[PDB]
Amino acid sequence: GPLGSEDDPIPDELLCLICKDIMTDAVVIPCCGNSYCDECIRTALLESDEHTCPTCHQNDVSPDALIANKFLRQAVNNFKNETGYTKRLRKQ
Amino acid sequence: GPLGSEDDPIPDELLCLICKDIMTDAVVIPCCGNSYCDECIRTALLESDEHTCPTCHQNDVSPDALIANKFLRQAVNNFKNETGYTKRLRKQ
Ligand SMILES: [Zn+2]
Ligand SMILES: [Zn+2]
Ligand SMILES: [Zn+2]
Ligand SMILES: [Zn+2]
């Protein structure tokens, strides 16, 4: 049936595994190929001295080796506009 | 108007720039981040001794450094099933 009208789950083709949610300005990891939030993937490598990838569990990656997944960022932007994905910010 | 009725173009978020068409099992280039057909991107580096990227015109890439854009391949698979994009395959 149809999805996206009032409900729809974010696909893994544009959803960060680290926070299990969509990301903006997503990057790619040259250790495996998965894409996540720039900050999310950075945190994984920063907190892991072994540079343990948060998906393939690699031990030779780097937050400086993060490439720009143009396609990812594009899809996310379109997806957000189709289903109208967004959230309510606060005055924190 | 809407898209998907009887005509729909392939977006740059899952469309290969090299052949200007969708691809399957797309890979990513760690030089810039763009994704293209494994065969297409391979050909670009294979024919260019300078390893001139077919998008950013880099000079230090490689067909071996091609990573697996999990997300790309997933998007392509879904997109193909949405519009019904496909072609004549052969059992060679
Ligand atoms: Zn990895
Ligand atoms: Zn994230
Ligand atoms: Zn490039
Ligand atoms: Zn191609």
Curated annotation (Swiss-Prot), chains A, B:
Phosphorylated by NEK6. Highly expressed in the placenta and testis. Expressed at lower levels in the brain, heart, kidney, liver and lung. Overexpressed in esophageal cancer. It is found in: Nucleus, Nucleolus; Chromosome; Cytoplasm, Cytoskeleton, Microtubule organizing center, Centrosome. A zinc finger (RING-type) spans 16-57. Interacts with p53/TP53 and RB1. Interacts also with MDM2 and YBX1. Interacts with NEK6. Interacts with ZBTB38. Contains a N-terminus DWNN domain, a zinc-finger domain and a C4C4 zinc-binding RING finger domain. The ring finger may indeed be a U-box domain. E3 ubiquitin-protein ligase which promotes ubiquitination of YBX1, leading to its degradation by the proteasome. May play a role as a scaffold protein to promote the assembly of the p53/TP53-MDM2 complex, resulting in increase of MDM2-mediated ubiquitination and degradation of p53/TP53; may function as negative regulator of p53/TP53, leading to both apoptosis and cell growth. Regulates DNA-replication and the stability of chromosomal common fragile sites (CFSs) in a ZBTB38- and MCM10-dependent manner. (Microbial infection) [Isoform 1]: Restricts ebolavirus replication probably by impairing the vp30-NP interaction, and thus viral transcription. This is E3 ubiquitin-protein ligase RBBP6. It comes from Homo sapiens (Human). The gene is RBBP6. The chain holds residues 249 to 335 of 1792 of the full protein.
